[PDB]
């Protein structure tokens, strides 16, 4: 009977770094997507495998809300079948994804003069992530032929890279807050339904 906690996801003061992307499980609640539909300020709102207009009338077993910050020209990677640093090493959606991706410019919240060094992405990895895999490890990356033995130095790099968001950057380089809603269509009873 309780409303789903979308406000805690969308309106959180800080979001996660994309390598350490945050997942809220949305369960046993009424999901009111009206405040999402009413906003004119989302730069991206795109669904996959679902009609995007009927969310207030649909029932799902569970909904997962994943959220993080990336830069604007990387939002294209938050979709099935993409490649690049984010899709390969940070947040991977499966090829037959069912859900919606919402994003908005967050330059006013996540940039600062001199640089915001709190938002990170994984720059180096030995293999691509599997869909919905999360890698928060900080093992030293061997870029050369000689092993690192856990020590940074020449040819041995910390795997995470700071975005350094600054508000005077071009829009493609500004931070964007992303929420990915994954819709679960199992055969168990529905526990997340819209108001109608």
């Amino acid at each position, epitope marked *: 009977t309780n409303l789903c906690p979308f406000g805690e996801v969308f309106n959180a003061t800080r979001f996660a770094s994309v390598y350490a992307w945050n997942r809220k499980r949305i369960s046993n609640c009424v999901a009111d*997507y009206s405040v999402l539909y009413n906003s004119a300020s989302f730069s991206t709102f795109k669904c996959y495998g679902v009609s995007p*207009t*009927k969310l207030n009338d649909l029932c799902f077993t569970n909904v997962y809300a994943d959220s993080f910050v990336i830069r604007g020209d990387e939002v294209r990677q938050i979709a099935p*079948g993409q490649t690049g640093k984010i899709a390969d090493y940070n947040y991977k959606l499966p090829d037959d994804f069912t859900g919606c991706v919402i994003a908005w410019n967050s330059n006013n919240l996540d940039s600062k003069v001199g640089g915001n060094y709190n938002y990170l992405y994984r720059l180096f990895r030995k293999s691509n992530l599997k869909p919905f895999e999360r890698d928060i490890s900080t093992e030293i990356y061997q870029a050369g032929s000689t092993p690192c033995n856990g020590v940074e130095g020449f040819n041995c790099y910390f795997p995470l890279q700071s975005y350094g968001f600054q508000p005077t950057n071009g829009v493609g380089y500004q931070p964007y807050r992303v929420v990915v809603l994954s819709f679960e269509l199992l055969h168990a009873p529905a526990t997340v339904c819209g108001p109608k």
Partner: single-chain antibody, 232 residues
Framework: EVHLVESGGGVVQPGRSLKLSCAASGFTFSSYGMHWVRQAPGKGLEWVAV????????FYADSVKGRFTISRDNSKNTLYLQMNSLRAEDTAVYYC?????????????????WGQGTTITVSSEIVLTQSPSSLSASVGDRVTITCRAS??????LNWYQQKPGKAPKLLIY???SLQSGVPSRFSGSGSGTDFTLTISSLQPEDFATYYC??????????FGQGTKVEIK
């Protein structure tokens, strides 16, 4: 018995405003989402806007965002498109289209029935590619039309027939399901990025332009560029 009648078109200068209307009958109007789709002279189909059955959800093509407003009055069974700040590349025939599934169905949506359109002249995403662009064949022949998607669209690929001068007609939905009233010679196959429409024995009334369109990732709903079929 579904009927859709657009009106409100005309010739206007750039920067002017124009309201289109679509009067619906023959179905329960308040149970269905509705779309506007347009077609510039000599060009293909371009999705414009969508509104949910109660008006609470609305999406727009990027080219019209901030200038067009989609609206509905379910008590009058009428759909509207308020077009402001009009401009030369808004010139097109505008069609209203009824959605295919009911309001509680999760499935990717598509264009069940279309009105005949109203014309506007303004005075002085997943990409689908079809092959071939045009072909000539004889009555009785097999015709094969391919549609490739830039990105996997699973099964959500639909086919429309557009006779010259007419509103488009849904032929196939969900890659291979036949729309009611469509003759058995039309069939569709494929999945992922690779789809085929086949007409097994071409008939005289089959000369038309055939369009694929994907419903997997929306908005925007997107269309192939069209395949023109002629009867020699």
């Amino acid at each position: 018995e579904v009927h859709l009648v657009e009106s409100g078109g005309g010739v206007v200068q750039p920067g002017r405003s124009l309201k289109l209307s679509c009067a619906a009958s023959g179905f329960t109007f308040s149970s269905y989402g509705m779309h506007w789709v347009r077609q510039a002279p000599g060009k293909g189909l371009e999705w414009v806007a969508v509104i949910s059955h109660d008006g609470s959800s609305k999406f727009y093509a990027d080219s019209v965002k901030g200038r067009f407003t989609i609206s509905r009055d379910n008590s009058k069974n009428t759909l509207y498109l308020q077009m402001n700040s009009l401009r030369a590349e808004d010139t097109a025939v505008y069609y209203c289209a009824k959605e295919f599934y009911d309001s509680g169905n999760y499935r990717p949506e598509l264009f069940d029935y279309w009105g005949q359109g109203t014309t506007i002249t303004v005075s002085s995403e997943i990409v689908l590619t079809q092959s071939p662009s045009s072909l000539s064949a004889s009555v009785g022949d097999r015709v094969t039309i391919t549609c490739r998607a830039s990105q996997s669209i699973s099964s959500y690929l639909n086919w429309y027939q557009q006779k010259p001068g007419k509103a488009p007609k849904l032929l196939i939905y969900a890659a291979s399901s036949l729309q009611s009233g469509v003759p058995s010679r039309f069939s569709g196959s494929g999945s992922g990025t690779d789809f085929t429409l086949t007409i097994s024995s071409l008939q005289p009334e089959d000369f038309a332009t055939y369009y694929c369109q994907q419903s997997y990732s929306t908005p925007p709903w997107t269309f192939g560029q069209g395949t023109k079929v002629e009867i020699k």
